[PDB]
Design a protein around this ligand. Structure first.
Ligand SMILES: CC(=O)NCCc1ccc(S(N)(=O)=O)cc1
Ligand SMILES: CC(=O)NCCc1ccc(S(N)(=O)=O)cc1
Lengths: 265, 264
């Protein structure tokens, strides 16, 4: 992988592995989400990090995911090479955004795109806060100054408000729990695990006859290593749409909400 | 990746990814096991299975894993490049073996080794059988003819008999179930999932103070997509453990194994 000429974005190529693909012999959406995290991490390393700015480490502040939106037009097949470009942007005092574009390395065509919103949190108290003047200054040195959006359209799916699923859910998968492979190097549940858990409550018949086109996830609370989760889904709709809710198995505390759009094969 | 000069083994390099490492910022044993499957698959593709031989497809025969043994001396760190070499061998009518050697790409030093035993099964009836002359002849064309072993030592850990854990287990993790990410492209539970489930019943304190050096797994029955599993572990001792995976309801054995851990 490498930073581009202007030093304001990063590109990396990945060969899709045998264990990374589903029944259609193309990369799962969780494989795509893991590749997005990996190219994001390689970009942060290339621009000097170990993207928590200098003032953030002094103030015990970290970035946490508020929303993730992914749209895939074609999933890369096993053995294919996919090129992913990523960049960051400051969104004033609200937070930051990381965007990605996925292309078929052979044709150069866009096969997918993604965007994520991140908010600042105190690592100790877990209290959210606005981005201060000093943090914005440090973050702006490796971002494009003019807006550069993976989803530019002035009425796009990535900015839609998601409602809370009301009981009873049409479908459910109960008693989901993370194992060590679902944790990251800091022993937190990896964000991609929540995508997998959301998808567990979609009927196998939809998965067999449809391809996932869009997924939007709204992160509300972090699942602990010893937590147990229920995944709920209700159909809202040649396209099928669903509303999703992840909540703790016991008290029902919301952890995530989202929506998915599927197109008939 | 590429076949070697003689066309009898295959090598591939992998850069360890951020999501592939554990709390020590080195690759987990499940990441290593997935890389072993991937280099094995690239080798099979390079030798013409673009490794079920021509006569196996006509007879509805497939290879299934009987045992997996992995020994790691050093886990590669996040961002490091690891080179893995793999090859296969016919073991008469018993079955076949796939072996692997892992090296640090910068130093050329051996950092790990693995070996796996495979037996022939009818895909429809699920009945096991001996390999047969025609299948051995077809398999021998891409294998070394003289023995080449990742574990040559005459009484090494990869060939030890594993006993059945007796109740009560010292530790347990119950109600484990596979999700779609644990399945392979044919909707079967990926073999690496069983390594993860075995490790779930090891106390977090051992994981925090020790590094896993050796794991041996004996595969007895396949876990279905809708099955639920219990993972049991008892200390037999470095720390050593005996493991058992069984179905949560009736207690049908699915796997048994052992692990050896070295103090950090
Ligand atoms: C007060 C408050 O909301 N704090 C943020 C806690 C917090 C919520 C969600 C996540 S995530 N992206 O892992 O789902 C992390 C931390
Ligand atoms: C009669 C008999 O044992 N048939 C083999 C069944 C069989 C057992 C185990 C596995 S594995 N490698 O997925 O754990 C697959 C198939």
């Amino acid at each position: 992988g490498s930073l581009t000429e202007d030093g304001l974005s990063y590109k990396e190529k990945f060969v899709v592995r045998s264990y990374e693909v589903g029944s259609n012999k193309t990369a799962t959406v969780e494989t795509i989400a893991n590749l997005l995290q990996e190219v994001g991490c390689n970009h942060a390393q290339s621009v000097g990090f170990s993207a928590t700015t200098t003032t953030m480490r002094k103030l015990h502040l970290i970035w946490v995911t508020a929303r993730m939106h992914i749209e895939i037009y074609k999933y890369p097949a096993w053995g294919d090479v996919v090129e992913i470009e990523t960049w960051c942007q400051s969104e004033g005092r609200i937070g930051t955004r990381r965007d990605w574009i996925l292309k078929d390395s052979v044709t150069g065509e866009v096969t997918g795109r993604a965007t994520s919103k991140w908010v600042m949190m105190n690592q100790d108290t877990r209290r959210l806060q606005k981005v201060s003047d000093d943090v914005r200054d440090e973050y702006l040195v490796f971002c494009p100054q003019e807006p550069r959006l993976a989803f530019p359209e002035e009425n796009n799916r990535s900015l839609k408000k998601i409602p809370k699923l009301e009981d009873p859910a049409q479908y459910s998968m109960i008693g989901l729990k993370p194992r060590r492979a679902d944790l990251d190097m800091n022993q937190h549940v990896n964000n991609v695990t929540y995508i997998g858990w959301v998808l567990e409550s979609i009927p196998q018949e939809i998965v067999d006859t449809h391809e996932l086109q869009v997924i939007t996830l709204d992160y509300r609370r972090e699942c602990q290593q010893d937590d147990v989760v229920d995944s709920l889904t209700t159909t809202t709709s040649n396209d099928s749409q669903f509303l999703h809710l992840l909540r703790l198995s016991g008290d029902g505390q919301e952890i995530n909400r989202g929506t998915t759009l599927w197109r008939k094969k």
